[PDB]
Design a protein around this ligand. Structure first.
Ligand SMILES: Nc1nc2c(ncn2[C@@H]2O[C@H](CO)[C@@H](O)[C@H]2O)c(=O)[nH]1
Ligand SMILES: Nc1nc2c(ncn2[C@@H]2O[C@H](CO)[C@@H](O)[C@H]2O)c(=O)[nH]1
Ligand SMILES: [Cl-]
Ligand SMILES: [Cl-]
Ligand SMILES: [Cl-]
Ligand SMILES: [Cl-]
Ligand SMILES: [Zn+2]
Ligand SMILES: [Zn+2]
Lengths: 195, 195
DNA sequence: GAATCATAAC
DNA sequence: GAATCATAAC
């Protein structure tokens, strides 16, 4: 079903032009429907963990979490910063970008194969088309990779709540196209300040 | 009601920053929801014609039609080409642009105040959000300003028909997001060829 | 006209 | 997960 669509990337990464990196253990691929200017997925190729729910991963598979984090902060940081530069602006330094990138799992992923999101904060993107998209990346539904186990969520109902800017906290109620306009403004503001 | 929203531009053009030009007779204003990279409206300020249906205008008010056309081809051509350059690419010549602009009325306008559309052909725009938007500008629902009276439409049902590229005629059925992707490609192609 | 919400079918 | 269609309320 549609929930298995990511399977191809960990079985045959060598043939996908949207794949940025692969080895025996992981695959780093551009999201087909990016929810920010830059939006990547890092997927484990391990057949025994790819179907483990990301909350169970966080609770019980610390070694994988730490391996994922090591790729992002280490060997793949170059690729990731360069990709962000390709997607946002060519003259952004790594330092400028390091605090404009978030890394995390969805608490209730629609796809079966374990995928870690690596994306810029802006949420400026044509593929961001409804409130549920936004809330899923800016609420506790987005389980940041460094979340203490004692703080992991579970129960959602966040998707009926009011929209708030992730950067300044302005509320927009359920007015998603107002939020969209504001996210573009926040991004122009951040970009102008950062170059 | 919402059908009267354009009234403000012909009553108080002097205060709107989206107004490009006004005199006693007409107002040229940026559409708030542009359906192409460049999308302008030219509105008569005449109180006795602004509420005349555009098909009746074409049938019975040749002098207005011809006045509108004269503004577009003459005194406002400079503004219009410069605006297109601001919206598409700064190094496009007028000749390059003259055949990438269409001028016309909707056959069934949602707004009460007579407005002539002046827009680029691309239909590449975030405000183009559904098939009805597209069809309304690329089908006979779009009454080109130079349409012979003997060829004017009336009856619609075009809005249930299949989507076709205005530039090459490829059909997309009712797959609007496929059409969107293709319009972007057609535009990149046109732009690369034209600069 | 725009925009939010709900609903199939994949 | 995406996307088409329908439906209020402005
Ligand atoms: N690269 C890629 N990403 C996808 C595909 N299908 C869904 N996604 C994204 O994967 C995430 C699933 O939680 C969402 O961000 C989806 O937009 C796909 O076929 N390829
Ligand atoms: N400039 C402007 N255009 C509008 C407004 N409301 C609707 N339109 C556009 O006017 C046209 C009406 O047929 C459509 O292209 C609408 O998107 C408005 O308030 N201001
Ligand atoms: Cl680590
Ligand atoms: Cl929008
Ligand atoms: Cl004329
Ligand atoms: Cl799209
Ligand atoms: Zn803000
Ligand atoms: Zn085409």
């Amino acid at each position: 079903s549609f929930r298995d669509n990511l399977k191809v990337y960990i079985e045959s990464p060598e043939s996908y032009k949207n794949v940025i990196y692969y080895d025996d253990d992981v695959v780093l691929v551009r999201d087909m429907f990016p929810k920010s200017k830059m939006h990547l997925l890092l997927m484990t190729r391990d057949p025994h963990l790819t179907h483990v729910h990301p909350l169970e991963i966080m609770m019980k598979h610390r070694s994988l979490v730490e391996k994922l984090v090591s790729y992002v902060q280490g060997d793949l940081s170059g690729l990731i910063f360069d990709e962000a530069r390709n997607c946002l602006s060519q003259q952004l330094t790594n330092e400028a970008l390091c605090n404009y990138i978030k890394v995390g799992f969805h608490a209730g992923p629609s796809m079966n194969n374990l995928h870690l999101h690596i994306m810029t904060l802006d949420h400026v993107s044509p593929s961001l088309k409804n409130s549920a998209h936004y809330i899923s990346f800016t609420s506790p539904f987005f389980v940041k990779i460094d979340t203490p186990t004692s703080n992991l969520p579970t129960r959602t109902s966040l998707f009926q709540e009011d929209l708030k800017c992730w950067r300044c906290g302005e509320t927009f109620g359920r007015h998603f196209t107002k939020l969209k306009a504001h996210l573009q403004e926040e991004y122009d503001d951040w970009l102008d300040k950062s170059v």
